[PDB]
């Protein structure tokens, strides 16, 4: 059956692991270990297609992807530095993949928190400059989580 190899990248502590665990295990982790590299595999139904999601959860911490088919580029809406650092991760992707045309979604996580320091308009403008969708998420409330992963699946489908 069809398998979508997704890779989740972004700065440390933005909620990459929490988002992944919320999609795959359907619960929120309040306290998680920084990642070296972890992978999750799950059979799902998306738009009437039964498929398998292989998600690679990568390290955000600097102390640390090529087979990836689609990329979730994650920042946290209450972490300006993570947003300012997004261009880096897009660059490495275009680099390792050898393409300016790679399925990718920009994700603004922790949208449940009220200490927003990155405005939606700014992230939208960035996403449009890359030619990609922008989706805001909360791994805590599950807001936008399916939207983000499923949009990525659909971007891979269109490619
Ligand atoms: N309120 C809230 N907290 C969140 C959300 N996502 C993650 N967190 C919290 O943020 C912390 C770090 O999340 P984590 O998933 O470990 O981040 P990471 O990007 O995987 N880290 P690393 O890059 O080091 O592997 C955890 O305490 C987690 O509960 C979210 O959407 N909302
Ligand atoms: Ca595939
Ligand atoms: Mg992690």
Curated annotation (Swiss-Prot):
Changing residue 137 to I: GTP-binding activity reduced by factor of 25. Gene3D superfamilies: P-loop containing nucleotide triphosphate hydrolases. InterPro entries: P-loop_NTPase, Small_GTP-bd, Small_GTPase, Small_GTPase_Ras-type. Changing residue 26 to G: Loss of interaction with PLCE1. Alternates between an inactive form bound to GDP and an active form bound to GTP. Activated by a guanine nucleotide-exchange factor (GEF) and inactivated by a GTPase-activating protein (GAP). SUPFAM superfamilies: P-loop containing nucleoside triphosphate hydrolases (SSF52540). It is linked to Costello syndrome: A rare condition characterized by prenatally increased growth, postnatal growth deficiency, intellectual disability, distinctive facial appearance, cardiovascular abnormalities (typically pulmonic stenosis, hypertrophic cardiomyopathy and/or atrial tachycardia), tumor predisposition, skin and musculoskeletal abnormalities. This is GTPase HRas.
